């Protein structure tokens, strides 16, 4: 279902047939762990098993003490968000007097409940671990206080297993200043996450999509340490909401297009700068310039709208005709004609310039193409690697079909002597404007030279009168004078 087109004229390629999964919002929930107040076992003895129990209890005490301390090309065009503003707003509300009390009330008899917080927002709260019950009601009544002993070694191992999740959560928060991403299976086990998905303000299709891609969901989620007080550890999990799914996406690949004159300094280059992911969205096109931060699983593209621009749908016309009048296609210019490759979804663009050796090879290192100077392309059918200079690239082996669209390299349409050749954030129109200004400045300079030339300069200063003849000053006496004859 994936197809690819290479546009020889602009050294670029579009891969299409993908489907969207865009993070459009956030869903916040409160995870709680119930704690015991026990600080010590107040007996002394020689029993080794209780000494092991006491060491584990120090780990619990120290983890509580730690959490208490915690409680107290076109990327530059993007806006600037605050990724955990939604979760931090929930966390800060949990610090208000009364809030933890509501959560304990709602969770006294059930492990999951919706709580109405002070600011009016309601959130799922759950209880994923009850260390208060285990320590107070399962471990302590087993300790014989007179001999300060316990009978069975398996109590040590059960305490270890019970305490472990709390220690790992504390470790993760302590090295991440209270905010972790991705969300680990200690923050939220797989089935806890799948249950929270089943309870989100989303359509059945969206529940299905996130449930089938929980590993992506995890990697886009945050866990935010909030409060530890009154026998409660609480942290906020901030989960992505994919409010746009199943919309068409396509990826644009671009590489430098240069003239191929032999003299090493004589060439001019342009590159399309609009590389990245494009997805249909609400009658517009969401454009993600940093394609590397999107995540692709098979034909599904997971992008975050925080890293996008909202563009008119006619931005695709740059792939039809870069000189189209409806959309001003983005480009940069240079005189640096260095060789490289861009590995696309179904092939490889090769920008080969100068003396650089550029080839494409099969599985057996058989060379099936030797590139000449210029921008060219091979598909991944029968090609495993491309080599540009000293760099070997493996090509993607995904299944699909590539189409080579012949066309004249547009760099050939530009006059190199008026070419604005160091533009980083330009466009077809802006480059045309600059060229026009350059041409007008030359023409105005010539029209000034013409208009000023051909006026007369000063005549000799010698007491003689002069007239004008054949572009020269000539003596008036030449035409008035008679032949002097002094005589006697």
């Amino acid at each position, epitope marked *: 279902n994936i197809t690819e087109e290479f546009y020889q004229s602009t050294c670029s390629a579009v891969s299409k047939g993908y489907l969207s999964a865009l993070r459009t919002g956030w869903y916040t929930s409160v995870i709680t762990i119930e704690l015991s107040n026990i600080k010590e076992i107040k007996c002394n003895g020689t029993d080794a098993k209780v000494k092991l129990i006491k060491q584990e209890l120090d780990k619990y005490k120290n983890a509580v003490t730690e959490l208490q301390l915690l409680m107290q090309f076109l990327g530059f065009l993007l806006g600037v968000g605050s990724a955990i503003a939604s979760g931090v707003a929930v966390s800060k509300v949990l610090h208000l007097e009364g809030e933890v009390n509501k959560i304990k009330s709602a969770l006294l008899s059930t492990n999951k409940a919706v709580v109405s917080l002070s600011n009016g927002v309601s959130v799922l709260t759950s209880k994923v671990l009850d260390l208060k019950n285990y320590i107070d009601k399962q471990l302590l009544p087993i300790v014989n206080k007179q001999s300060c002993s316990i009978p069975n070694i398996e109590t040590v191992i059960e305490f270890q297993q019970k305490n472990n999740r709390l220690l790992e959560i504390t470790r993760e928060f302590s090295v991440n200043a209270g905010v972790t991403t991705p969300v680990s299976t200690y923050m939220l086990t797989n089935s806890e996450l799948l249950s929270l998905i089943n309870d989100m303000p989303i359509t059945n299709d969206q529940k299905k999509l996130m449930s089938n891609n929980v590993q992506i969901v995890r990697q886009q989620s945050y866990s935010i340490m909030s409060i530890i007080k009154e026998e409660v550890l609480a942290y906020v999990v901030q989960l992505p909401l994919y409010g746009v799914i199943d*919309t068409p996406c396509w990826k644009l690949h671009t590489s430098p297009l240069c003239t191929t004159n032999t003299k090493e300094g004589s060439n001019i280059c342009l590159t399309r700068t609009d590389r990245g992911w494009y997805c249909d969205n609400a009658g517009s*096109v969401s454009f993600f310039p940093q394609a590397e931060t999107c995540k692709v699983q098979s034909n599904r593209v997971f992008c975050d709208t925080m890293n996008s621009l909202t563009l008119p749908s*006619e931005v695709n016309l740059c792939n*039809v005709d870069i000189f*189209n009048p*409806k959309y001003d296609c983005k480009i940069m210019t240079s005189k640096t004609d260095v060789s490289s490759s861009v590995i696309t979804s179904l092939g490889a663009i090769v920008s080969c310039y100068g003396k650089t050796k550029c080839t494409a090879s099969n599985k057996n290192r058989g060379i099936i193409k030797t590139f000449s100077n210029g921008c060219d392309y091979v598909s991944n059918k029968g090609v495993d690697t491309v080599s540009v200079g000293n760099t070997l690239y493996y090509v993607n082996k995904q299944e699909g079909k590539s189409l080579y669209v012949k066309g004249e390299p547009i760099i050939n349409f530009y006059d190199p002597l008026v070419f604005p050749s160091d533009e980083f954030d330009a466009s077809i129109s802006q480059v045309n404007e600059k060229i026009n200004q350059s041409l007008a400045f030359i023409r105005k300079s010539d029209e000034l030279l013409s208009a000023i030339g051909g006026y007369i300069p000063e005549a000799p200063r010698d007491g003689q009168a002069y007239v004008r003849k054949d572009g020269e000053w000539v003596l008036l006496s030449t035409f008035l004078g008679s032949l002097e004859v002094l005589f006697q």
Partner: nanobody
């Protein structure tokens, strides 16, 4: 995810005229290459004509050159195929198709297709 629906097919007699139309649903044709294809009984689809914006780049197959006219309204909601001087040859099911990417004639690279409307030229 533009949706397409053709109209205008029917019986016409050789030398006459016929206009097909194709309406966009879900979103407009804005930024989409729209092409017409036709498939006669026993043959595979054949490229007819394409356009990319209202009053923009056109291209016809050499067989329809001079006789067919493709266009799109300024609102980019409908693409039209005006067929003048019809020949029995021209009898086929005519399909509307749309795509991102460039203006190509390869049917396999068109992602969105109409339902097809029948054109019959009698002699």
């Amino acid at each position: 995810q533009v949706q397409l629906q053709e109209s205008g097919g029917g019986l016409v007699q050789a030398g006459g005229s016929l206009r097909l139309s194709c309406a966009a649903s879900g979103q407009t044709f804005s930024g989409y290459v729209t092409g017409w294809f036709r498939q006669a009984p026993g043959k595979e689809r054949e490229f007819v004509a394409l356009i990319a914006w209202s009053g923009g780049r056109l291209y016809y197959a050499d067989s329809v050159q001079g006789r067919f006219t493709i266009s799109r309204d300024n609102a980019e909601t409908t693409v039209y195929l005006q067929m003048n001087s019809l020949k029995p040859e021209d009898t086929a099911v005519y399909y509307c198709a749309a795509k991102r990417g460039g203006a190509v004639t390869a049917a396999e690279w068109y992602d969105y297709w109409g339902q097809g409307t029948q054109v019959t030229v009698s002699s």
